[PDB]
């Protein structure tokens, strides 16, 4: 549903894990992707904490929520123009037909 922002504590702990028990190929690749993604799944964070147990837990929490879908992203420009024309006609209808 949401990941954890890559704050200073997150970055430092990921760097430590990269050369720690979490240095496995899959775990290291996931940590690198999170650094690229600016956030890590918090279940993976708990797994890395277990591997280390190290760094403290307190940090400036910031939850990266799953981005909301952008409505109309797949619209073609011709479709956008068609919708705009239809919207103009609908707006006109409110008083042209009055």
């Amino acid at each position: 549903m949401f990941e954890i922002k890559l704050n200073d504590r997150i970055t430092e702990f990921l760097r430590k894990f990269k050369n720690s028990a979490k240095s496995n190929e899959g775990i290291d690749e996931d940590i690198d992707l999170f650094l690229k993604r600016h956030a890590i799944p918090m279940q993976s964070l708990l797994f890395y904490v277990k591997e280390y147990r190290i760094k403290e837990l307190l940090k400036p929490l910031e939850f990266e929520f799953k981005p909301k879908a952008v409505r109309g992203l797949h619209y073609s420009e011709d479709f956008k123009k068609k919708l705009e024309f239809l919207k103009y006609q609908e707006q006109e209808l409110e008083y042209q037909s009055m």
């Binding site: 929490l61 939850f63 909301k68």
Partner: protein
Amino acid sequence: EKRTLIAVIADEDTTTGLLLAGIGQITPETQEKNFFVYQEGKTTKEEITDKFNHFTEERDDIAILLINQHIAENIRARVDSFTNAFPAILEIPSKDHPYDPEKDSVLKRVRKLFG
């Protein structure tokens, strides 16, 4: 504890889904309508707050109050004012508005901890 019934304020389709799940339209005894069918664009904050108060203050047997999350977002202030333990409120996803963690009280409350 005498709380043994479930209350819902929801959309018609979410209410239909909950009915299909097994929730009933009225309590097993002294049955009363426990479903409020919110309609988009046809219900003001006053009605939603009134029914929320109806289910949270009265109807002492209501253990769980299931609310479609858009309804809660409409009346977020009232829900934030609400504070109790016998009745438990739970926002559930709607047909057109899926569950949005950015409008969940738990996320903000945990973020306030900074740990």
